[PDB]
Amino acid sequence: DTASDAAAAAALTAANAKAAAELTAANAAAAAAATAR
């Protein structure tokens, strides 16, 4: 049904947005550490 579908889409949007924040910070931190060596 449409409300289950929309709740599931909201769940995927939040999980991907959080993962995008996480991985961006990790990447930036990893690039700065490798550069310094």
Amino acid at 25: A
Resolution value (Å, 1 decimal): 1.7
Number of folded domains in the chain?
1
Q: What is the DSSP string of 5-30?
A: HHHHHHHHHHHHHHHHHHHHHHHHHH
Q: Which domain holds residue 2?
A: 1-37
d(CA 7, CA 3) in angstroms, rounded, equals: 6
d(CA 36, CA 24) in angstroms, rounded, equals: 19
